[PDB]
Design a protein around this ligand. Structure first.
Ligand SMILES: COc1cccc(-c2c(F)cc(-n3nnc4c3C(=O)c3ccccc3C4=O)cc2F)c1
Ligand SMILES: Cc1cc2nc3c(=O)[nH]c(=O)nc-3n(C[C@H](O)[C@H](O)[C@H](O)COP(=O)(O)O)c2cc1C
Ligand SMILES: CCCCCCCCCCCC[N+](C)(C)[O-]
Ligand SMILES: O=C(O)c1cc(=O)[nH]c(=O)[nH]1
Length: 363
């Protein structure tokens, strides 16, 4: 009912009226005010996952970049997400790139963006999360954890110190932190994925994390690009296991342009998301799971808009999944859709629950 209405009428009309950045801002505003069809899908026990030191009521989260500044967290749980990731947040406020900087590719169910880490900054987000800190503690206890994605300022001279500052300021307010060294829209950022400097970077991040008081000590994950060489992936897997990184987020957007894109805006600079990313991301999950011997939890992200998409990433090795771009084309009803379809498929394929399906393709 709602699914078809949003997919066929409301969302196409919103897109026809509003440029994508304006549409996004509106979406954040409506969500933050709770103006949603409060999801009627009740999460079953077979969607529950225990990972990263926490219970997740369902495995479907909102990816970083939708709520960059932590303004819509409670609205996103109301939408039915099992967990919420905010950010990326940079140490100091910054405006990001000039407009236009986000583009729809409707023929491809894809988006291209070059926001460039527009961020209200750590201090503003810190106070925003503090204002609801105990509400979040209850939510987390009830299986609805919060992640915080950390970025670095454009003019930063020391990337590791930017991330360290983020750990110190928002680590105490997060169930998990993400070190995003994979945005395609900040010069030299991705080069932080190389081995020598990744080890240095992550050693410092983990030191800072370990310095937090026990009840305020988050898991630390690394978010990687889909555009890594085999060498890059081997090196990341090695460092992650060496240092005891708690997990991986796989993947960010791609700077590649797969053959077959039809959208008029396909040659815009930026990271590509949505369906053309889907299988590239799933294969990166598959590879990283194997390289880490299934011992490092993976959050799978890229082009998920159905239960099949979710289950493919779970069977490839993901313990949890996220989506973003599907919201742009399907609206809020897509969250319940993915969860309902995922539950149905798990039953069909003989899994007792999500946990039994994690990494199943490798076995
Ligand atoms: C009353 O019903 C509700 C309730 C809550 C939210 C919404 C809603 C929504 F979920 C997505 C959009 N939306 N349409 N096009 C786009 C978006 C983005 O969010 C977006 C984000 C980032 C890049 C690009 C885009 C983009 O191109 C518009 C909405 F109003 C509708
Ligand atoms: C408009 C937009 C902004 C994004 N901003 C961030 C960000 O700030 N930090 C981050 O780690 N990922 C960011 N992402 C990447 C998403 O978190 C996700 O990894 C990617 O879009 C693939 O998922 P999807 O195909 O479901 O959208 C952004 C994606 C989009 C489309
Ligand atoms: C194998 C790499 C190819 C690039 C990505 C492939 C996209 C698969 C097409 C399914 C998407 C359907 N749609 C509506 C979004 O166009
Ligand atoms: O802010 C952005 O441009 C951005 C950051 C990121 O990590 N990924 C992405 O696609 N865009």
């Amino acid at each position: 009912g709602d699914e078809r209405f949003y997919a066929e009428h409301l969302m196409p009309t919103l897109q026809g009226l509003l440029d994508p950045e304006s549409a996004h801002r509106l979406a954040v505003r409506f969500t933050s005010l709770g103006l949603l069809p409060r999801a009627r899908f009740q999460d079953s026990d077979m969607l529950e996952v225990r990972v990263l030191g926490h219970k997740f009521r369902n495995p479907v989260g909102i990816a970083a970049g939708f709520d960059k500044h932590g303004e819509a967290v409670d609205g996103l749980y109301k939408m039915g997400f099992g967990f919420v990731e905010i950010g990326s947040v940079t140490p100091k406020p910054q405006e990001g790139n000039p407009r236009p900087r986000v583009f729809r590719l409707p023929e491809d169910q894809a988006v291209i963006n070059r926001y460039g880490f527009n961020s209200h900054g750590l201090s503003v987000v810190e106070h925003r999360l503090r204002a609801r800190q105990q509400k979040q503690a209850k939510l987390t206890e009830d299986g609805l954890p919060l992640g915080v994605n950390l970025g670095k300022n454009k003019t930063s001279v020391d990337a590791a110190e930017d991330y360290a500052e983020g750990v110190r300021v928002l680590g105490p307010l997060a169930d998990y932190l993400v070190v995003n060294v994979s945005s395609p829209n900040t010069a030299g950022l991705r080069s932080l994925q190389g081995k020598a400097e990744l080890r240095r970077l992550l050693t410092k991040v983990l030191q800072e994390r370990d310095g937090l008081r026990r009840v305020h000590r988050p898991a630390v994950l690394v978010k990687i690009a889909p555009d890594l060489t085999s060498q890059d992936k081997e090196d990341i897997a090695s460092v992650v296991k060496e240092l005891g990184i708690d997990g991986l987020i796989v993947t960010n957007t791609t700077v590649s342009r797969p053959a077959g894109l039809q959208g008029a805006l396909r040659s815009e600079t930026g990271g590509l998301s949505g369906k053309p990313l889907r299988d590239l991301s799933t294969q990166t999950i598959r590879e990283m799971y194997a390289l880490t011997q299934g011992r490092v939890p993976i959050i799978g992200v890229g082009g998920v808009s159905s239960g099949q998409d979710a289950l493919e990433k779970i069977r490839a090795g993901a313990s949890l999944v996220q989506l973003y771009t599907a919201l742009t084309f399907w609206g809020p009803p897509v969250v319940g859709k993915v969860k309902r379809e995922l539950e149905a498929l798990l039953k069909e394929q003989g899994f007792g629950g999500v946990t039994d399906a994690i990494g199943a393709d490798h076995r």
